[PDB]
Every structure is written in C-alpha cells, then in structure tokens.
Amino acid sequence: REMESFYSELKWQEKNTLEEIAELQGDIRRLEEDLRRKMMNLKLAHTRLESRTY
Amino acid sequence: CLLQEIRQQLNSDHRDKMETLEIDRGCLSLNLTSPNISLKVNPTRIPKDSTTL
C-alpha cells in the first residue's frame, strides 16, 4: 500500500513537469523571434542616419 | 550687377533645399521589410559640417 501510493504521486509530478517544459519552450521561441525583429529596427535607424548625412 | 549676384546666391540656396527635401522624403519612405536596410557603420557620428538650427 505505501509503495503504490508513492508511485502514483511520482507519476503525477512527472505529468506536471512535462507540461511546464512544453509551454516554456513556446515562450523561449517567442523571445528568440523578437530579438531578430529588434535587430531589423536597429538596421533601419542606422541607415536613416547615414542617409541623412549626404 | 548687385542683383545678379544676389540671384546667384538664392539659386544655390534653392538647390540645397530641393536636394534636402528629396533625401528626407526617401528616409521617410523607408520602412520595415525594405530591401535597402542594413546595419550602418558609425551611425551616431557627427560630420564636419555640424551646423546648428
């Protein structure tokens, strides 16, 4: 009885940890795409300055 | 003679303002996803002209 209670609890914690890992991967890829979008805005500002310096 | 010289200087000033308007309209027309954007070398520099308003 004691052994099977502990076994059931450990699988429930396995389930919740796997769900958290999946949703944290989704947030990681959203952060990673917003890095490149901000790089695009940086390129635009640099070429506006060097456009006006002619 | 004096009027000829004054008109020469005003012609030069008009040319400068037309070229200025043209470059500023191009800089406004640029946006995202445009094929001319890039990271520019030293974009925060101040050139030798450096006129104030």
Task: Output the DSSP codes for A1-45.
Answer: -HHHHHHHHHHHHHHHHHHHHHHHHHHHHHHHHHHHHHHHHHHHH
In chain B, residues with a C-beta closer than 8 Å to the C-beta of A48 are 27, 30
Q: How far is B47 from chain A, CA to nearest CA, in Å?
A: 7
Data resolution in angstroms: 7.7
Is the Cβ pair B37, A47 closer than 8 Å? yes
Is some CB atom of chain A closer than 8 A to the CB atom of B31?
yes
CA distances from A53 to A18, B25, B36 (A): 54, 14, 16
- Name, in order, each residue with C-beta under 8 angstroms of A43's C-beta and a sequence gap of 6 or more: B37, B38, B39, B40
Give dist(CA B47, CA B53) in Å, integer. 15
